[PDB]
Amino acid sequence: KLFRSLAMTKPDRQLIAQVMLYSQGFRTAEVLANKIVPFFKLCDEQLSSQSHYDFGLRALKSVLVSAGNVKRERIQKIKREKEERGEAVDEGEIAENLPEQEILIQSVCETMVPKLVAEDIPLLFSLLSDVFPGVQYHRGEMTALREELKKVCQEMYLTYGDGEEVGGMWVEKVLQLYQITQINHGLMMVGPSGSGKSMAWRVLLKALERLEGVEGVAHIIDPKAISKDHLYGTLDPNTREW
Amino acid sequence: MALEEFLKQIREVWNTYELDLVNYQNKCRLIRGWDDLFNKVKEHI
Amino acid sequence: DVVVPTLDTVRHEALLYTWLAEHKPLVLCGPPGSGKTMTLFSALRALPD
Amino acid sequence: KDPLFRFFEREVKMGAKLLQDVRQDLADVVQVCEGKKKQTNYLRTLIN
Amino acid sequence: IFTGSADIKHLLPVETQRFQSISTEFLALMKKVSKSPLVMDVLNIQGVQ
Amino acid sequence: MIFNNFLARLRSIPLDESPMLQIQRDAATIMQPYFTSNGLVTKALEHAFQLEHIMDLTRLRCLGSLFSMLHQACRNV
Amino acid sequence: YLTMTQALEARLGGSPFGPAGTGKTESVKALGHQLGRFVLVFNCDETF
Numbered sequence: 001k002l003f004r005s006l007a008m009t010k011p012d013r014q015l016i017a018q019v020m021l022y023s024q025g026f027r028t029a030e031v032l033a034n035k036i037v038p039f040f041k042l043c044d045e046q047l048s049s050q051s052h053y054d055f056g057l058r059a060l061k062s063v064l065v066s067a068g069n070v071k072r073e074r075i076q077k078i079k080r081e082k083e084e085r086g087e088a089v090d091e092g093e094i095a096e097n098l099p100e101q102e103i104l105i106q107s108v109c110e111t112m113v114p115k116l117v118a119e120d121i122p123l124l125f126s127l128l129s130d131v132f133p134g135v136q137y138h139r140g141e142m143t144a145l146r147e148e149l150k151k152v153c154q155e156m157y158l159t160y161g162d163g164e165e166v167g168g169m170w171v172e173k174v175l176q177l178y179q180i181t182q183i184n185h186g187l188m189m190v191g192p193s194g195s196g197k198s199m200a201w202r203v204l205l206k207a208l209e210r211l212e213g214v215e216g217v218a219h220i221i222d223p224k225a226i227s228k229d230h231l232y233g234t235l236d237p238n239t240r241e242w
Numbered sequence: 243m244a245l246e247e248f249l250k251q252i253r254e255v256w257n258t259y260e261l262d263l264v265n266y267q268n269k270c271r272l273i274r275g276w277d278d279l280f281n282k283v284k285e286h287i
Numbered sequence: 288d289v290v291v292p293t294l295d296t297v298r299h300e301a302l303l304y305t306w307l308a309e310h311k312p313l314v315l316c317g318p319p320g321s322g323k324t325m326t327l328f329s330a331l332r333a334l335p336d
Numbered sequence: 337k338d339p340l341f342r343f344f345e346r347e348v349k350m351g352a353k354l355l356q357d358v359r360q361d362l363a364d365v366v367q368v369c370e371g372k373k374k375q376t377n378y379l380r381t382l383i384n
Numbered sequence: 385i386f387t388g389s390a391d392i393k394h395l396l397p398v399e400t401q402r403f404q405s406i407s408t409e410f411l412a413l414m415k416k417v418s419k420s421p422l423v424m425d426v427l428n429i430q431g432v433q
Numbered sequence: 434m435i436f437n438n439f440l441a442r443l444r445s446i447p448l449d450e451s452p453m454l455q456i457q458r459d460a461a462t463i464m465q466p467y468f469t470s471n472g473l474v475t476k477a478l479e480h481a482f483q484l485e486h487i488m489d490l491t492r493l494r495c496l497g498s499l500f501s502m503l504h505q506a507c508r509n510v
Numbered sequence: 511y512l513t514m515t516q517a518l519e520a521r522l523g524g525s526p527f528g529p530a531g532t533g534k535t536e537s538v539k540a541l542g543h544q545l546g547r548f549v550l551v552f553n554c555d556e557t558f
């Protein structure tokens with residue numbers, strides 16, 4: 001009785017997407033939102049049910065923020081490429097001649113693909129083709145990261161791979177984990193026992209160590225091997241000391 | 243000039259000295275020549 | 288202490304030795320009284336260290 | 337590319353998995369009932 | 385006195401086991417000395433004294 | 434992948450801490466044709482999943498046991 | 511905003527509820543920042 005309760009059950013995802021795409025500078029914000037919100041609904045109601053799937057408002061917010069960020073990066077790459085190739089840089093045509101739909105699809109594939117099961121990837125790409133016709137996703141090939149992964153795997157007796165070779169899938173998973181670490185500060189590697197998760201993140205950490213020159217320190221904590229009081233802390237009932 | 247030559251002779255004796263090991267019933271490789279090693283240590287000290 | 292040698296006994300002795308020699312953890316599974324701890328201790332008498 | 341086939345494929349997957357699970361559980365139940373097999377913890381809970 | 389006499393195993397099993405452990409340690413030390421017969425190499429063995 | 438990792442570790446890391454590593458390389462060379470896709474070990478492991486076991490069967494449990502006792506075979510040699 | 515302002519005027523608290531991900535904490539923080547207030551977020555558990 002001391003609080004006034006309000007039921008906040010269905011956020012207006014379409015208006016949120018439209019306004020947040022309009023603010024970031026997307027000229028086609030209306031159609032992009034009307035194509036991306038039903039896309040998330042289609043993913044929710046068409047992909048296989050898994051305990052690690054979320055297609056809610058947080059996922060949509062992450063997709064929109066990442067789409068904006070990669071749009072700024074694409075503007076910057078167009079700037080430098082035009083500068084090194086000639087002198088014709090102007091904001092008008094570059095903003096006009098910008099694949100915004102490709103940017104949105106790139107953000108979606110960077111955020112949603114790594115969490116899908118093997119069988120749902122064709123499902124997601126079919127949904128992308130249905131809702132976003134003609135737009136294709138061509139993931140970047142981080143070269144120096146790949147040779148650094150090669151060196152790290154060779155040093156620690158691990159089997160590197162590429163494409164369809166033995167080791168290609170695990171390297172692809174490492175690259176997706178790297179992308180998600182760049183995008184998100186909260187990571188979960190979900191998969192059956194002994195699927196290569198530990199080696200994947202160790203190899204990624206050592207590759208980033210040897211590439212960027214900053215040293216990576218990993219703290220491995222078993223949250224259930226100790227009580228929650230030992231995991232987070234105790235407040236003394238007597239002395240009120242932490 | 244004399245003192246350093248004492249140092250170099252001790253250096254070469256102790257970097258070329260080897261323990262005298264021989265076989266013992268095909269079970270191990272035991273050491274003999276305790277007296278010579280001990281006398282060398284006393285004289286060097 | 289005494290253990291009567293048997294086919295299963297010697298086979299499990301060999302397996303336990305070839306598993307504990309390299310300090311690999313293991314679990315003996317079976318009904319109570321089957322001889323799991325007897326088999327383990329009889330494999331430990333061959334490893335005095 | 338057909339969404340209807342996608343939904344139907346999910347439905348048949350879930351139905352087949354549940355049907356196999358239920359039939360296997362019932363077979364274990366009837367085998368326990370004739371004394372052919374011993375009753376396990378999961379079987380104990382299912383019978384209870 | 386331990387290996388040559390086989391009756392001491394019956395009378396002193398734990399003594400024989402302890403001496404066997406000491407004998408393995410001493411034989412490891414002997415092998416380490418034999419592979420490097422130099423006096424200083426023996427002296428620089430970690431925790432030799 | 435796991436077979437390649439085990440073979441590389443056998444050919445690289447000595448078990449004592451060299452004759453031992455030479456024995457390791459020879460044993461790995463002898464075991465190479467069996468540690469392949471659709472090899473004896475792969476087919477046996479596939480068939481092992483069809484049997485009933487006292488506990489749930491995990492591929493890495495059997496693989497680790499096999500690798501451990503292969504190391505012990507190297508120690509025996 | 512309407513419900514929380516009505517609660518505040520009556521000197522009552524605000525208790526937005528619903529499934530996770532609907533923007534309840536964010537809405538509370540946005541309302542507090544709209545009035546220029548210092549909004550503190552506490553993750554409550556059994557130790558509080």
Ligand SMILES: Nc1ncnc2c1ncn2[C@@H]1O[C@H](COP(=O)(O)OP(=O)(O)OP(=O)(O)O)[C@@H](O)[C@H]1O
Nearest residue numbers: 158159170192193194195196197198199434435438
């Ligand atoms: N890319 C790889 N190539 C070869 N061997 C690998 C590779 N990745 C992992 N392994 C090996 O296979 C096993 C997998 O262990 P790993 O720690 O990677 O699994 P995991 O999925 O993190 O395990 P869990 O979740 O059960 O702790 C280990 O023995 C590891 O050395």
Ligand SMILES: Nc1ncnc2c1ncn2[C@@H]1O[C@H](COP(=O)(O)OP(=O)(O)O)[C@@H](O)[C@H]1O
Nearest residue numbers: 289290291293296318319320321322323324325
């Ligand atoms: N091969 C055997 N030789 C002698 N005794 C045996 C043999 N196999 C089983 N036993 C007897 O069976 C018993 C096994 O019990 P125990 O090993 O304590 O069970 P658990 O391993 O489940 O604790 C021992 O008391 C032992 O005397």
Ligand SMILES: Nc1ncnc2c1ncn2[C@@H]1O[C@H](COP(=O)(O)OP(=O)(O)O)[C@@H](O)[C@H]1O
Nearest residue numbers: 016057058061529530531532533534535536537
């Ligand atoms: N009206 C809105 N406009 C833009 N983003 C929103 C809106 N409502 C919620 N969000 C986004 O949803 C995400 C999760 O909301 P949050 O308040 O954490 O949900 P919960 O009520 O479960 O805590 C936030 O990151 C926020 O940015």
Ligand SMILES: [Mg+2]
Nearest residue numbers: 194197198199
């Ligand atoms: Mg792991």
Ligand SMILES: [Mg+2]
Nearest residue numbers: 531534535536
């Ligand atoms: Mg919240």
